[PDB]
């Protein structure tokens, strides 16, 4: 409905291709904190928090090291997913880039399960772009 979803694609950590994507679903949410800002006297758009689930496979053997380097630098890792949209005609686009993705609960062992198997994880995101316009 107001939920976006997609199937095949790729997951990236900066310039590194780190997994393939089987599917995703995402929803945008109005929070009370966003409601306060939009009501400020002194200004028709509103901030939003993105949340979803994504299913990953063919995880890179380099994920362990890439995450360790993020921790060393002090930077929580932020990803990009590219995926084939469901119902592309409704969007006027065939693919989506879901950006600034955070995985609050994915562990090193979860990444491990996704090398030879598949892993479904919740995620948050803050922006997106439509790709392959039609």
Author numbering: 7 to 49, 52 to 142
What does the paper say about this structure?
A rather recently identified group of PTLBs are the R-type “diffocins” from Clostridium difficile, which constitute the only Gram-positive R-type PTLBs known to date. All R-type PTLBs consist of an inner needle-like rigid tube surrounded by a contractile sheath. Binding triggers extensive conformational changes in the baseplate, accompanied by contraction of the sheath, which, due to extensive interactions, drives the rigid inner tube into the cell envelope. Here, we have determined the crystal structures and SAXS envelopes of the R-type diffocin tube and sheath protein CD1364 and CD1363 in their pre-assembled monomeric state.
The R-type diffocin tube protein CD1364 crystallized in space group P43212 containing one molecule in the asymmetric unit. CD1364 possesses a compact fold with a central β-barrel flanked by two α-helices at both of its open sides. Whereas α-helices α2 and α4 cap the β-barrel on one side, the α-helices at the other protrude away from the β-barrel such that α1 covers the β-barrel of a symmetry-related neighbor. Higher B-factors indicate increased flexibility for α1, which hints at structural changes that may occur during tube assembly. As was suspected from the molecular replacement process, CD1364 shares highest structural and sequence similarity with XkdM from B. subtilis as well as with gp104 from the bacteriophage φ812 tail tube, and the overall fold for these proteins is mainly preserved. Notably, in XkdM, α1 does not protrude away from the core of the structure such as in the crystal structure of CD1364 discussed here, but rather caps the β-barrel of the same molecule, again suggesting a high degree of flexibility for this region in both CD1364 and XkdM. Particularly, a prominent loop (K33–G58 in CD1364) is variable and folds into a flexible α-helix in CD1364 (α1), XkdM from B. subtilis and HCP1 from the T6SS of B. pseudomallei, whereas these residues form a protruding β-hairpin in FIIR2 as well as in gp19 from bacteriophage T4. Notably, in the tube protein CD1364, α1, which interacts with a neighboring molecule in the crystal structure, sticks out of the calculated envelope. Comparison reveals that the architecture of the central β-barrel mainly remains unaltered in the assembled tube whereas positions of α-helices α2, α3, and α4 are significantly changed.
